[PDB]
Amino acid sequence: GANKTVVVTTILESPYVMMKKNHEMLEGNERYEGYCVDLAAEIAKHCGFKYKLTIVGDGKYGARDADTKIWNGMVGELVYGKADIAIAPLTITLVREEVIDFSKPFMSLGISIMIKKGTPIESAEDLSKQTEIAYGTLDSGSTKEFFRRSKIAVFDKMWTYMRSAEPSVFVRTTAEGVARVRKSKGKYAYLLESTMNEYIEQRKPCDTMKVGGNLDSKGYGIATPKGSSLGNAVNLAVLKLNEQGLLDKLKNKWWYDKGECG
Amino acid sequence: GANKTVVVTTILESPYVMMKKNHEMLEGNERYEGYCVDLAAEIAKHCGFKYKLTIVGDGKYGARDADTKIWNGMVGELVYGKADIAIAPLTITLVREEVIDFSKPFMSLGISIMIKKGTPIESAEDLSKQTEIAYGTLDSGSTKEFFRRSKIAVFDKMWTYMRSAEPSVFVRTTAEGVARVRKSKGKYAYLLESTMNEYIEQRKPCDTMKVGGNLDSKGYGIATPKGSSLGNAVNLAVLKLNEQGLLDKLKNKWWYDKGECG
Ligand SMILES: N[C@@H](Cn1c2c(c(=O)[nH]c1=O)CSC2)C(=O)O
Ligand SMILES: N[C@@H](Cn1c2c(c(=O)[nH]c1=O)CSC2)C(=O)O
Ligand SMILES: [Cl-]
Ligand SMILES: [Cl-]
């Protein structure tokens, strides 16, 4: 069985995957840039395969519909054989681990609070005790699911708040959440994964801040279909890249080396 | 094939596994206490197996002799079938991943610097540039191997320093390293995993401090023999315990709830 080009599924999400400014002049994988573009190339180099970057059709990370039992997002593309590997800020979770294979984490993170500078909030407990400062999450993904499924008193109270708050505290994209923080004069706080919070804190106009400790401790993993032979090699590649210091260099490149906030 | 009692290998290392003060009055698993004792019980409860805690014979975590190609430590006990699972502060590394299976991490950590309070050191770079303040690691394990194998200029210089420094800067146990920091009047700094550094910082006589950022970003994993059926279940149990908040509660219990330094 001859080797085939590996189909990678990913998602447009700065700074992980972005279309280059001059992408119309380019073709194939060269149209894209970012942390996960660089990571894909490093993994392919170490493992010795050719690959094609593709963008997940439905714009989702991965969840199972309770009624149809169908998996959507990048997880679904792996489950149904439409892609060979997912390389994205994809959180390792129990229900996802049951249906796909994950590498050991290439990045550690946790849920965190983004505020407009000057907002009198220091913690999740602070948020949970009040309603003047509205707060919410993406309307899809592991951050929302954290609150929806939590049995911890503070986070379950926060979820009950989010479901019943008006106007809706949910956002469709990271950009919408960040924009809402920036335009709401301190009256909206955004719950999001800490590494995204850190990235935005170093972007103009430098008006946001990460506050408080993380609410949990999770990781992003490279995902493959359950039992795929590619899985073992890619996991070893992640560990090698981490042990060589290259993952730390990649985060510095896309987060801090060109930070815009001094 | 009837079920059998699961043989767990672990290692005496505070606060992960300790013999209880009254252990002579007790028997079996009840002789022991600590973070990994509690974790083993939680994993066994979720997975529905009985188990026996045993202490690794050679007191090592796991490495392969370059000449004989024999694996020692807890990794060796798994490789050669002497134990079914290792539950310990065992770092997930590439060479270990090649021969045993690892769960996703139950704890995140990195190499860090422990100083006696008042030592004029803030970073690994600070240490690397001088010799008046001696510095070293355990004489076995992943922290030592980090320096021995590093191709990063600062850490390779530190390793060349450690090999050639007199008297020997290596220690046999965590307790020896901590004691050496405490007795050396600021002239010894100890390189060790960050969660151990954090634990000791909250122990009397409250004379040590963790300084600087971590040098790397790694995780501890539950280990099983390659291909063991127990591996999948235990990995799902780790993810469940993390998602329920129980791993965070376990760290707080053994690190901070009874911290001795205010
Ligand atoms: N990592 C999440 C998706 N996701 C992401 C971000 C966030 O803040 N929350 C969230 O749930 C910033 S990049 C992706 C998942 O795998 O579902
Ligand atoms: N986790 C290491 C062993 N190990 C440990 C500690 C440390 O500081 N360095 C180190 O290498 C404090 S508990 C165990 C390993 O798996 O080899
Ligand atoms: Cl092809
Ligand atoms: Cl038995």
Side-chain angles (χ1 to χ4, degrees), chain A residues 92-95 97-98 102-105 108 152 215-218 235-236 239 242-245 248, chain B residues 92-94 97-98 102-105 108 152 215-218 235-236 239 242-245 248:
Chain A
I92 298 166
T93 68
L94 170 68
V95 291
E97 180 72 285
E98 290 183 313
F102 278 111
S103 73
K104 303 302 190 288
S108 295
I152 305 288
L215 288 60
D216 64 353
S217 298
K218 307 283 160 61
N235 179 57
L236 298 180
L239 294 177
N242 195 31
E243 287 179 14
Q244 292 174 321
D248 295 324
Chain B
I92 298 166
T93 68
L94 170 68
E97 180 72 285
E98 290 183 313
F102 278 111
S103 73
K104 303 302 190 288
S108 295
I152 305 288
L215 288 60
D216 64 353
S217 298
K218 307 283 160 61
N235 179 57
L236 298 180
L239 294 177
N242 195 31
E243 287 179 14
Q244 292 174 321
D248 295 324

Side-chain angles (χ1 to χ4, degrees), chain B residues 70-124 126-128 130-147 150 152-155 157-182 184 186-203 205-239 241-247:
Chain B
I70 296 170
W71 284 91
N72 66 22
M74 284 174 289
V75 175
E77 291 196 355
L78 298 171
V79 163
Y80 302 117
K82 311 297 195 173
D84 300 308
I85 186 165
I87 303 181
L90 181 66
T91 302
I92 298 166
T93 68
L94 170 68
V95 291
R96 291 171 175 168
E97 180 72 285
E98 290 183 313
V99 298
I100 53 168
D101 289 344
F102 278 111
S103 73
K104 303 302 190 288
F106 62 84
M107 174 173 278
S108 295
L109 64 311
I111 297 172
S112 69
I113 300 164
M114 173 189 290
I115 56 161
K116 183 89 172 189
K117 284 178 176 188
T119 301
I121 290 295
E122 290 181 340
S123 68
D126 283 354
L127 284 174
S128 76
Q130 57 86 64
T131 61
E132 168 75 4
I133 299 163
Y135 57 95
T137 68
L138 286 164
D139 65 13
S140 179
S142 66
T143 301
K144 181 187 173 184
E145 193 70 351
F146 176 86
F147 291 99
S150 186
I152 305 288
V154 56
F155 307 139
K157 178 170 183 185
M158 290 173 73
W159 177 244
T160 286
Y161 159 85
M162 293 182 201
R163 291 203 75 192
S164 64
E166 303 190 288
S168 172
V169 298
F170 300 102
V171 296
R172 180 62 66 91
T173 66
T174 298
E176 183 184 351
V178 171
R180 189 166 175 179
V181 171
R182 288 176 164 156
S184 290
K187 302 302 183 180
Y188 185 78
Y190 180 45
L191 290 147
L192 79 171
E193 287 173 340
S194 58
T195 50
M196 185 63 68
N197 206 349
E198 293 164 347
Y199 165 76
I200 296 295
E201 189 171 319
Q202 302 312 311
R203 302 292 292 179
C206 308
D207 56 349
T208 66
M209 171 173 182
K210 174 162 84 69
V211 296
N214 293 346
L215 288 60
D216 64 353
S217 298
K218 307 283 160 61
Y220 298 150
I222 306 288
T224 48
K226 209 167 184 178
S228 162
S229 58
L230 184 61
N232 168 63
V234 163
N235 179 57
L236 298 180
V238 169
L239 294 177
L241 292 171
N242 195 31
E243 287 179 14
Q244 292 174 321
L246 289 170
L247 299 181

Side-chain angles (χ1 to χ4, degrees), chain A residues 8 10 12 16-20 22-23 26-29 31-34 37-38 51 53-55 254:
Chain A
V8 178
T10 191
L12 292 181
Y16 299 98
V17 183
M18 310 172 278
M19 299 206 77
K20 288 175 182 172
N22 61 329
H23 64 89
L26 309 178
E27 79 179 334
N29 297 339
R31 293 168 294 165
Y32 301 104
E33 67 181 341
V37 179
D38 286 352
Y51 66 100
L53 296 177
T54 71
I55 307 301
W254 290 102

Side-chain angles (χ1 to χ4, degrees), chain A residues 141-147 150 152-155 157:
Chain A
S142 66
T143 301
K144 181 187 173 184
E145 193 70 351
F146 176 86
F147 291 99
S150 186
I152 305 288
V154 56
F155 307 139
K157 178 170 183 185

